């Protein structure tokens, strides 16, 4: 039970100072308690609390956010459909990516390819593209049109294979799954730049360079899911430019408003923009609260804060290096096999031994603990099975990292004992 | 800046439910402000909105209490998970309140980010309640043609807008659709009651083809908002309750539009003595002040899905929505709307019923529609009636009224706060708008 929260810190009812290294839920990228946000939300609910997002008319809070996103991501992205959540964004992407192919006269290109252990929402669509299997479990989920493939989890799958060749491989597991559905039946492949909720699953640097080749030889679209990775998480404003990707569609959410408002949307490449506006008809997809003005206001201010105050540029050039390098330092711990991270996200692997390397029978019970001990030691840290992870706000300081490591290293040293 | 705002809107901003292209030339209507039942666009024109914007602004605009609680809840923590939370979190209230104003048997509620998201969950858990009752073959949900139940890939499969399916093979497994009770557009002569029984017994018709063992549930909006204001012969709903019993299936009444006073009563279920098993609500749950929706869960299905099956809501939006319901009950907004102004508006809408171009004038509560027709007593429909309403809208907006065209059906759903003097404005504004459209053809 928390009373207050400011910057990167939380305080519970007993005074308990807690460093939220989890940005709450991957989103609070400015940190808690930048009142600049509640003022503009208070003040925009005044003029217009709500008006329709385009059915007849538009409204300014949304046009402004639209420019800003056209601006942090101008490149080939200069258009944004809005929506009420990040899962609701992927529903949009799935339907319009099928509309794109329809208008080019290929209604058979309607299969989108995801990956096992991807997360792409909670809706019926979004849970079907995601490969958690715990959201598929209700019977019929992978709705027709969805196929899934290999995740590039170098550590949990093939800990020995040359990381470079393991990347190159598991990238061709896409070129595999194409010649057996049929290129002409595939509309697109969809990935998170870095799988977040599935573990901080970082591809070998070989993976993405491959997957781009594969969407060239073949006539299919790329859908990079920047919902967690977006707005500084990878040091860069978006993962697509850490991984030199030129997506066709991007769902975004969460850090769009640093979690302070229900809001998401899909950016649209100038490629798939062209086909939808011209040579196109009515787009009967749409959604009340799409560019809801209050959230658009809050989100506009949120991005406005981030570039004006230079929050992400510091995070990526000043602090991301420091965090990643200190994280690897826990790599030399008896309980830690691999230490991963790009930018402002990272993960530790909980393992029984290092030199002969044996998993736990049920690694979840260990990680499920080790987090509950980080909180009890003043640090929030998600557990995915036996993987521990952090996704801090981008306003962390070079001192708040020394805090986070030293608190993590205590939490690890403590976890070892209760087993031994 | 208009000239400039409109530039940017086409330049990058995208635009739910719109050609994208036939409106980048013509420019967008940019609305800056709003208070009461009025909006103001960039040219400062006052517009009377009898559409609650999009059926939601049941409070009427510019209600200060809502921004004050939103400013205040942003001060506490966003999200409310299990390990830590905001003391006295808004989500807890709202479920107590939402339980109080809901046909009794609904005493559990699950929150979600929209009304479409809500209908997905309901699709998920309706099959999940049958699984746990050992009938996993019970998976078919049944909507009606021209119904609207959301815009997620689930919602668009569930809604009988045939314009969203044909673009591909979208209506996903497990979804069938049936006749709508549009007495005017299907059987304008048939006895209004007989059509209701016939379009309702068309449900016992489908199940006799599919197999009772396949249908999981039935779903309708008490009245279909969108597709028109397609109000059922008073015979209809008493049938569907019968058909839904002897057949062992769940009822999903969709109260997103029809919910929170829109039909004079708090909900449509109330007005039609329906006892939904699942209720998606999300338009006027916060009177549009903030994105949020959810599902009510009848005590029946709530015991199977919550209990020995313990598996499977933004806090700031929960607060706003909680206070919106508060205001509406304390200040009797919905009680008056249904007893003072609803009978009143329901009379004078029927007046426009006999302008030279009106065949039917339909209405319940603070919702209602009329039908646009070529000749009245000779009875004729328009060739491409959509082109017609397209005009009557632009003339209603320029005559200062937001009045909505679904094909050839003109609709209004003003805030519940409309005053008896404000209907005269809306009636006269519409009446002028009507004689304006009559000339542009005749
Ligand atoms: C990759 C990805 N896509 C979509 C989502 C949708 O989540 P939500 O519905 O909370 O916006 C998530 C959120 O992290 C995600 O990680
Ligand atoms: C019955 C019903 N469900 C859902 C919706 C809309 O869903 P959402 O609020 O998520 O856009 C509407 C109208 O748009 C509706 O009338």
Chain B contact present for A98, CB below 8 A = yes
- Is the domain of B281 the same as that of B429? no
Residue A338 in 3-state DSSP? strand
Name the packing angle between helices A36-47 and A293-308 (round to 10°).
150
Compute the nearest-CA separation of A368 from chain B (Å): 12
The total number of structural domains that make up chain A: 2
Q: Is the CB of A11 under 6 A from ligand 2?
A: no
State the CB neighbour count (10 A cutoff) for residue B36.
17
Tokens of A98: 């099928």
Gaps in chain A (C to N over 2.5 angstroms) fall after none
- Is the domain of A114 the same as that of A14? no
Structure-derived torsion over alpha carbons of residues B263, B227, B52, A64, reported in degrees to the nearest 10: 150
- Is the domain of A120 the same as that of A190? yes
Residue B134's contacts (CB-CB under 8 Å, 6 or more residues apart) are none
Residue A303 in 3-state DSSP? helix
- Is the domain of B78 the same as that of B207? yes
Most ligand 2 atoms within 8 A of CB, residue of A52, A85, A287 to mutate? A287
Instruction: Among B300, B331, B362, give the residue marking a domain's end.
Output: B331
Chain A contact present for B162, CB below 8 A = no
- Is the domain of A123 the same as that of A252? yes
Tokens of B84: 């830590």
* Euclidean distance between CA atoms B59 and B337, whole angstroms: 11
Q: Taking Cα atoms as reference points, which of B131, B223, B210, B212 lies closest to residue B175?
A: B210
Closest atom of ligand 1 to CA, residue A226: 1
Task: Tell whether the torsion through CA atoms of A398, A404, A410 and A412 is positive or negative.
Answer: negative
Q: Which residue of A41, A88, A138 is in closest CB contact with B117?
A: A88
For residue B173, give the chain A residue with the closest CA: A143
CA atoms in the 13 A half-sphere facing the CB of B346: 16
Residue B35's contacts (CB-CB under 8 Å, 6 or more residues apart) are B61, B62
Spacing, Cα B224 to ligand 2 middle (Å): 11
List of long-range contacts for A237-241, beta carbons under 8 Å, 24+ apart = A237/A72, A237/A73, A237/A312, A238/A72, A238/A73, A238/A193, A239/A192, A239/A193, A239/A194, A240/A193
Q: Is the CB of A122 under 6 A from ligand 1?
A: yes
Query: Which of chain B's residues have a Cβ under 8 Å away from the Cβ of A261?
Result: 291, 314, 316
- Is the domain of A61 the same as that of A89? yes
Q: Is the CB of B257 under 6 A from ligand 2?
A: yes
- Is the domain of B260 the same as that of B281? yes
- Any idea what the Cα angle at residue A153 is, between residues A345 and A27, rounded to 5°? 25
Chain B contact present for A373, CB below 8 A = no
For residue A66, give the chain B residue with the closest CA: B13
CA atoms in the 13 A half-sphere facing the CB of B101: 25
- Looking at residue A231, the DSSP 8-state letter turns out to be T
Instruction: Among A309, A332, A360, give the residue marking a domain's end.
Output: A309
- Is the domain of A115 the same as that of A162? yes
- Is the domain of A171 the same as that of A254? yes
Is residue A236 annotated as involved in ligand binding?
A: no
Chain A contact present for B13, CB below 8 A = yes
Chain A contact present for B402, CB below 8 A = yes
- Is the domain of B72 the same as that of B133? yes
Distances in whole angstroms, Cα of residue B177 to Cα of each of B161, B174, B203, B253 = 10, 10, 9, 15
CA atoms in the 13 A half-sphere facing the CB of B197: 4
Cβ-contact B5, B373 below 8 angstroms: no
* Euclidean distance between CA atoms A37 and A59, whole angstroms: 19
**Residue span of the structural domain in which B404 resides:** 1-62+332-442
Distances in whole angstroms, Cα of residue B280 to Cα of each of A84, A130, B221, B243 = 16, 25, 10, 22
- Is the domain of B68 the same as that of B215? yes
Most ligand 1 atoms within 8 A of CB, residue of A83, A130, A227 to mutate? A227
Q: A34 phi and psi, to 5 degrees?
A: -90, 100
- Is the domain of B286 the same as that of B414? no
Q: Indicate which residue's Cα is closest to atom 8 of ligand 2.
A: B115
Q: Are strands A186-191 and A9-12 parallel, antiparallel or unpaired?
A: unpaired
Residue B127's contacts (CB-CB under 8 Å, 6 or more residues apart) are A138, A139, A140, B136, B138, B139, B174, B216
Spacing, Cα A253 to ligand 1 middle (Å): 7
Q: Taking Cα atoms as reference points, which of B167, B274, B57, B430 lies closest to residue A282?
A: B167
Instruction: Among B273, B307, B331, give the residue marking a domain's end.
Output: B331
Compute the nearest-CA separation of B258 from chain A (Å): 15
Residues in chain B: 442
Q: Indicate which residue's Cα is closest to atom 14 of ligand 1.
A: A228
Chain B contact present for A37, CB below 8 A = yes
Structure-derived torsion over alpha carbons of residues A154, A155, A156, A157, reported in degrees to the nearest 10: 40
Q: Structure resolution in Å?
A: 3.5
């Amino acid at each position: 039970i928390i009373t207050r929260a400011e910057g990167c810190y939380l305080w519970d009812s007993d005074g308990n100072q807690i460093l939220d290294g989890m940005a709450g839920l991957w989103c609070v990228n400015i940190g808690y308690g930048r009142k600049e946000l509640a003022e503009v939300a208070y003040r925009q609910m005044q003029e217009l609390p709500y008006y329709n997002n385009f059915f007849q008319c538009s409204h300014p809070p949304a046009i402004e956010l639209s420019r800003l996103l056209s601006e942090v991501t101008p490149k080939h992205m200069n258009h944004v459909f809005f929506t009420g959540s990040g899962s609701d964004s992927n529903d949009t992407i799935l339907r319009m990516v099928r509309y794109y192919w329809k208008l080019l006269g290929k209604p058979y290109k309607k299969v989108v390819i995801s990956r096992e252990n991807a997360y792409h929402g909670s809706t019926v669509a979004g849970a079907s593209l995601s490969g958690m299997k715990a959201m598929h479990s209700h019977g019929d989920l992978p709705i027709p049109g969805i196929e899934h493939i290999e995740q590039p989890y170098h550590f949990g799958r093939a800990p020995d294979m040359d990381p470079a060749e393991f990347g190159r491989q598991a990238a061709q597991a896409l070129e595999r799954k194409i010649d057996e559905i049929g290129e002409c039946n595939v509309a697109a492949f969809i990935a998170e730049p870095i799988q977040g909720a599935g573990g901080v699953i970082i591809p070998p640097d070989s993976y993405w360079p491959e997957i781009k080749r594969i969407c060239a030889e073949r006539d299919i679209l790329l859908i990079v899911d920047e919902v967690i990775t977006g707005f500084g998480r990878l040091g860069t404003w978006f993962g697509s430019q850490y991984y030199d990707l030129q997506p066709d569609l991007m769902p975004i959410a969460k850090g769009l408003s640093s979690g302070y408002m229900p809001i998401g949307g899909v950016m649209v490449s100038d490629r798939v923009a062209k086909v939808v506006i011209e040579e196109g008809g009515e787009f009967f997809h749409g959604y009340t609260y799409s560019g809801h003005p209050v959230a658009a206001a809050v989100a506009a201010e949120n991005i406005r804060i981030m570039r004006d105050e230079g929050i992400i540029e510091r995070a990526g050039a000043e602090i991301a290096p420091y965090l990643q390098a200190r994280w690897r330092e826990l790599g030399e711990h008896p309980l830690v096999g691999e230490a991963r991270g790009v930018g402002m996200v990272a993960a530790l692997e909980l393992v029984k031994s290092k030199q002969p390397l044996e998993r736990f029978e049920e690694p979840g019970k260990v990680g499920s603990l080790c987090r509950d001990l980080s909180v009890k030691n003043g640090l929030v840290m998600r557990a995915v099975g036996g993987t521990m992870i952090i996704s801090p706000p981008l306003v962390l300081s070079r001192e708040q990292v020394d805090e986070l490591i030293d608190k993590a290293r205590r939490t690890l040293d403590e976890t070892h004992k209760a087993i031994g």
